């Protein structure tokens, strides 16, 4: 004797020892990315190629 | 008969029960079963319980 068994209810595990099918379908995909940058360029110049006479002391 | 027709006793009450079933023996006036999958699913469940695996 197996006890009350339903007639229209789906066949589910109910007690200890009942078997159940597991469809293993795992798909995990995690990602991360990052970046940082900095730049700085400078040029300076001053040339008195021909100095006038009133400014040759400076 | 006034007190029984006017009052009710505490703890003397009716509950509601619900269930799902199948009705068979209809003269072609049942479900289409193409738009109600649960009818065929539960019929197959009943057959599987009774020993027929469709």
Curated annotation (Swiss-Prot), chain A:
It is found in: Cell outer membrane; Bacterial flagellum basal body. It comes from the Bacteria. The basal body constitutes a major portion of the flagellar organelle and consists of four rings (L,P,S, and M) mounted on a central rod. Belongs to the FlgH family. Assembles around the rod to form the L-ring and probably protects the motor/basal body from shearing forces during rotation. This is Flagellar L-ring protein. The lineage of its organism: Bacteria, Pseudomonadati, Pseudomonadota, Gammaproteobacteria, Enterobacterales. The chain holds residues 59 to 116 of 232 of the full protein.
Curated annotation (Swiss-Prot), chain B:
The basal body constitutes a major portion of the flagellar organelle and consists of four rings (L,P,S, and M) mounted on a central rod. Belongs to the FlgI family. Assembles around the rod to form the L-ring and probably protects the motor/basal body from shearing forces during rotation. It is found in: Periplasm; Bacterial flagellum basal body. It comes from Salmonella typhimurium (strain LT2 / SGSC1412 / ATCC 700720). This is Flagellar P-ring protein.
């Amino acid at each position: 004797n197996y006890g009350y068994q339903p007639l229209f209810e789906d066949r589910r595990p109910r007690n200890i020892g009942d078997t159940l099918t597991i469809v293993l379908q795992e798909n995990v995909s995690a990602s991360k990315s990052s970046s940082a940058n900095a730049s700085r360029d400078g040029k300076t110049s001053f040339g008195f190629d021909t100095v006038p006479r009133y400014l040759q002391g400076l | 008969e006034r007190i029984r027709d006017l009052t009710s006793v505490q703890g003397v009450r009716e509950n509601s029960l619900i269930g799902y079933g199948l009705v068979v023996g209809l003269d072609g006036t049942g479900d289409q079963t193409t738009q109600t999958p649960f009818t065929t699913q539960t019929l197959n469940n009943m057959l599987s319980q009774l020993g027929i695996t469709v």
